Design an enzyme around this catalytic site. Sequence first.
Site, mmCIF file in Angstrom:
data_model
loop_
_atom_site.group_PDB
_atom_site.id
_atom_site.type_symbol
_atom_site.label_atom_id
_atom_site.label_comp_id
_atom_site.label_asym_id
_atom_site.label_seq_id
_atom_site.Cartn_x
_atom_site.Cartn_y
_atom_site.Cartn_z
ATOM 1 N N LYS B 161 0.793 -1.152 -0.108
ATOM 2 C CA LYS B 161 0.078 -0.220 -0.158
ATOM 3 C C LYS B 161 0.615 1.289 0.013
ATOM 4 O O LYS B 161 0.676 2.235 -0.759
ATOM 5 C CB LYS B 161 -1.024 0.083 1.193
ATOM 6 N N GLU B 187 -1.777 8.672 13.071
ATOM 7 C CA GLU B 187 -0.807 7.822 12.357
ATOM 8 C C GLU B 187 0.030 7.573 13.608
ATOM 9 O O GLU B 187 0.717 8.423 14.160
ATOM 10 C CB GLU B 187 0.015 8.528 11.361
ATOM 11 N N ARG B 188 0.292 6.017 13.690
ATOM 12 C CA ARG B 188 1.256 5.614 14.862
ATOM 13 C C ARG B 188 2.704 6.027 14.323
ATOM 14 O O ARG B 188 3.149 5.864 13.162
ATOM 15 C CB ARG B 188 1.078 4.096 15.001
#
Lengths: 51, 479, 125, 120, 501, 145
Positions: B161, B187-188
Amino acid sequence: ASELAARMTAMSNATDNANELKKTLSINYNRARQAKITGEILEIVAGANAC
Amino acid sequence: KNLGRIAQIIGPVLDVAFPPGKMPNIYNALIVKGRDTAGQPMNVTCEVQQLLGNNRVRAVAMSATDGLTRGMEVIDTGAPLSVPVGGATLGRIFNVLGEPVDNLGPVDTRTTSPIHRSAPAFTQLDTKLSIFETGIKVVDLLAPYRRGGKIGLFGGAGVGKTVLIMELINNIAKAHGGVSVFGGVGERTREGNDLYMEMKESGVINEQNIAESKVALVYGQMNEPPGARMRVGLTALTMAEYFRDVNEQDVLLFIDNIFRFVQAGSEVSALLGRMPSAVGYQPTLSTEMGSLQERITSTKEGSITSIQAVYVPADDLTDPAPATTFAHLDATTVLSRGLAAKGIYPAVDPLDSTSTMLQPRIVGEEHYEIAQRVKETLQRYKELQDIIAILGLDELSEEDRLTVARARKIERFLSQPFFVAEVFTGSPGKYVGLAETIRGFQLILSGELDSLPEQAFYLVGNIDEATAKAMNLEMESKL
Amino acid sequence: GLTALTMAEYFRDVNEQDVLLFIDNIFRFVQAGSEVSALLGRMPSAVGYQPTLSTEMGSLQERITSTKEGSITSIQAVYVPADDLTDPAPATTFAHLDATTVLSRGLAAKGIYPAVDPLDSTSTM
Amino acid sequence: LQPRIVGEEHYEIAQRVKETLQRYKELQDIIAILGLDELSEEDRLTVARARKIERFLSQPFFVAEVFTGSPGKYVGLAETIRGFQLILSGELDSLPEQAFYLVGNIDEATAKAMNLEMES
Amino acid sequence: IRADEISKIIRERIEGYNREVKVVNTGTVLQVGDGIARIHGLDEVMAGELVEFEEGTIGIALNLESNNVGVVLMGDGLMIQEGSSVKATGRIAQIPVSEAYLGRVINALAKPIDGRGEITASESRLIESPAPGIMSRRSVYEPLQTGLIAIDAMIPVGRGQRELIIGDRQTGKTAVATDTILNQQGQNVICVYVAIGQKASSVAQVVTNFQERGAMEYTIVVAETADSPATLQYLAPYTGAALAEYFMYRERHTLIIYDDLSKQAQAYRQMSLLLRRPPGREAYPGDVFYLHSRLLERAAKLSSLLGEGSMTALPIVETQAGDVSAYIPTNVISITDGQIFLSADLFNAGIRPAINVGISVSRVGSAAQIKAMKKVAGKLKLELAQFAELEAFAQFASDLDKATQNQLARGQRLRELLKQPQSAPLTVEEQVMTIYTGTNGYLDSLELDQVRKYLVELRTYVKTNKPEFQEIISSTKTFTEEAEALLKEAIQEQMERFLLQ
Amino acid sequence: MEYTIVVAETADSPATLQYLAPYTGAALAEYFMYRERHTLIIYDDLSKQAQAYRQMSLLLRRPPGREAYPGDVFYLHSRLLERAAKLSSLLGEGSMTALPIVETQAGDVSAYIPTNVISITDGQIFLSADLFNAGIRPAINVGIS
Ligand SMILES: Nc1ncnc2c1ncn2[C@@H]1O[C@H](COP(=O)(O)OP(=O)(O)OP(=O)(O)O)[C@@H](O)[C@H]1O
Ligand SMILES: Nc1ncnc2c1ncn2[C@@H]1O[C@H](COP(=O)(O)OP(=O)(O)O)[C@@H](O)[C@H]1O
């Protein structure tokens, strides 16, 4: 050979009937789970409205 | 300027006490002069969500609240959140506040724009439904994008992705005059760092020459309060929207991912104490999704094409968040672990992926019929997947043997050597227009190149390079 | 429950002998807490139990433990409303109970008594 | 629906129709996946009788004549009980299902059957 | 009928109304019950600041309201009276932290409960510090060997990766946790185990176990029993994280076990409902995601300049009736990198550890694997995918083609491979031995049951009689053709002697 | 467009305006309907209006039910729809045909808003996702329509 072709036709029909069954049952399940979660949240917020 | 004190704080929800005359509007950002344990001033920002009366607003914090004190000085900025925009932000990581976090240097750009805005007017849109050409064969033929429309991204990890994202940026940069933006809503941080480093290595961010990059990354992490993770998307949106309203560049707006913005809005409404809707989302799910999904258009000036990831919770396509998101989406490309595990990259499944843009009166009857015949051949291959193994490939009839043969040729020609995955692989990157694509599939499927080896179509750009590789492979097979 | 626990706790403390503490039913304690919670002024939590449910069960179970002096063996029975182990009070007791046995209406209805569902019942021993 | 009110014949035929429809409702879960072929002789018998029964329950109405096009039939108890007695006795077992669909009397059902055997 | 208006405060204001004067020096207790206390005054107290009730009951000023400070009580108050005078403290929830914490049991105040002695410390670390930033990290590099063949092959965990353990009641979550902690005696990591709302007897069992094993030399066991207050149950994992990040920032490696986070979220929802905060799903507040995100993202692999310290968070959540799409499960699944999914139907079936190999994922992946481990793990994963596809063909093993018959055979033996005894962790080299013996095809001969005994005898025989293998892999960490030939030789030797039995 | 009037309130418009727009269309249609002119109005959708009404009802802390829809969610649609009539011959015979649209998730006709609208309108034209995705366009399911 005729009997095994018969069993192969029986399976080729029965597995697809089980397919449509699992699909409609998963749809009913999604609707039921959504309704359950909504009812639980609304009954929670009803107590907060009571206080 | 307008000075007010803090009335009360309950987590990231603060109350500010202004004098009777001066009082901010809705969505007005508020800087709160506040301290740190080392005494250092730390300016915590908010946004007025409700004018609850008694000369007192209820603003939602955009940062940590621990340490803020009842009666601290809050300054009214008097306008919605204004982020730094323009070509300065290229190759620079940002926050929801537009304050960068890469430690490179301060954004010296003077141009700001309010995070809040109305959608482009009805007398402004560009009515031409055009297929946004990408250069990738699979998403060009089977899942054709539209320009200024929204495209959902369905891929579980390990399908490439992120490599697909970097390739899309690279193509919109090289072929067109485009610039991309990435908005990491929730977003980690470890994967945020991973993506930043992979862009540094993949040339998408020219680490040596900033502002010659192709992306302006907006990272709003999960670490941030629920108020910030929502407005991250609007930050990325306005930073993209400048790039096409003023510069008329074809922008790509990646939102990764929509579901987490939806649940961040749900958390904001939960803290605000407004009655919930159905299964647990905020009552303004449709209107909140609209406020972000209607600035993404193709106006007379430019076009924002939104390639956003979507996540389905409890496998529902009928949960409010997926349902509302799909109500806006225009085409979905679905990446499968099967093609990743095998080696047909990218791992897009040309059957699970669909587009509403693949209508004949939009793409041309020739494109439509070739796509239909390709889909029919690949579907017949999936249907024969079990049959051929038992029956033996020879016991098949001639029509079905032709079908499996051409299906293998097609499925292998769907592979493409990427511009950004060359660092890993070693195969040079390639760009394939739709002319090359439609003619390549016409040749493969029309029985004309039915005399080539399977491997001669694998990770190749177009049908001309396919013929070149085929002649190479045949000379290599003779001796 | 706390009354009988204080009696048994005396028995184990100073009379320093093993004790058997059968409790029945233990779910009705959390039931009474849930009945009294909302009227006291607490906001209702999930499906209707008090917010002070985990600490209530703590204030019972962690008081019931075996020490160096005495050993309180406690064979207590948890009601499960509508046979749903997801119900919060049965879910909460599970964390404090060493050896657990689950009765299944299938085994009870078929005629197999005692109806201990074996694969769901687990011990730590 | 109690004999003291409705007569023993009415009550008994009502209980037998309820019985057979119950048995078909039970076998529905099996037949959904399998088909009628996998059932016993008595099971398949009850299923065929229940098909005929649940179609014979249907009746065209005078006020639905604009949607069905077929003239509504009025059929009271003297013919209702008799027709159902016959269907559950199995004298009419030779008839198809579509003969009982959308008719008022068992005689009209049999006439429609004679038509379905006139159309070879 | 209003709070904060006690008809004595109105008296004091009627006396002293002249102008509104700062009153932060003082503070009185208006309403107190079920673990919270509404407090007047304290107009300059921060959020999160410790406020100290008279008689010694510490509290924390969580939600500062209009004219009253809602305070959670860090104990059972039950003695503070109405109108009693509270003083502020100024500190914000700190713990002293030193290397002397290694080897002890503490409560969530970093105050020992093992009764051994006081823990001398110099430097303090805040409990709610901010996480490492977007430009203060490094991409995950180094394999954390958990000791489980299945995990170390198929769900590779790294150093600085937040790998979630998720399961039902009694599927072995704490089992895998202790298995990992006990594996990490050899390499140099500090283990942290934070128990939230568990039995003191269960904490006693695990602590005694680490004692008799020797892994207490590098572990700090934070314990918060069920009777403890909701605020202490909530504050436990953050004390664990502060302790752990102190060791992290000094270039050392850490591992922390939140067991579980479900009870932390339940304490949080209890407190939030108790001091009247708006509920969400299951009456959780909106901030449970904020909580878990801050706590989890505090643990990551630091960059090169800051010392290459790291901190693996191995949290645990328990799932009820397999509703893994519930609120707290979907929260922790979204925040974490990986998920090790445990299934009770495998647990009953004998396959222990009962991990679910098709559901379990790790977005760190083979990056955090030894080269030998990845060389064998590719083949292992392909074989297991194949047998997972063929699972619905085992009854028909009488009339399948012999090829799929043999794939069923290989996957059948491979299931026998992956089972392990309780808390017996393996080393990476022994695991490479096992996966190689399996993947090459050396267990088709022995019947379906003997495989476990055969493999343990294999490992011991190799250990005793070909000590070059473990040395080769310890030096290079790469599966080389020399060790491949050596392992083939040792394998066939052990096979012959075992068959002569 | 010589005949058409398009009353548009898009997605990112206030839920109160999305709740008002069908009634603006209804007044416009009725003006011509009463002066001996035939009308045809196309609501699109009613379920989006139902969602907007749910939003502006839960923003008012109003007691919801049946998937969080307010009490007057049948009253909404019935008020809006029942003013579409074939007028009498005394009032000029001008008629307002209404063809409202409703969206269903997973074909949930038994959902609250689909069954409510069904209990108002004079029929239903059920389109089918499988028929439309198989190529039979338009996908009128004449079995149930
Ligand atoms: N890999 C294994 N092999 C053999 N036995 C095991 C294994 N894992 C767990 N067990 C057994 O299962 C029992 C439950 O283990 P454990 O307490 O770790 O589960 P748990 O998930 O912690 O339970 P809970 O969810 O109630 O805390 C233990 O008594 C142990 O003996
Ligand atoms: N287009 C591609 N071409 C070649 N390899 C790819 C491609 N996409 C993914 N890969 C393989 O997958 C890995 C990267 O996948 P990534 O985009 O990080 O997916 P995720 O983030 O979901 O794990 C690389 O190691 C690469 O070998």
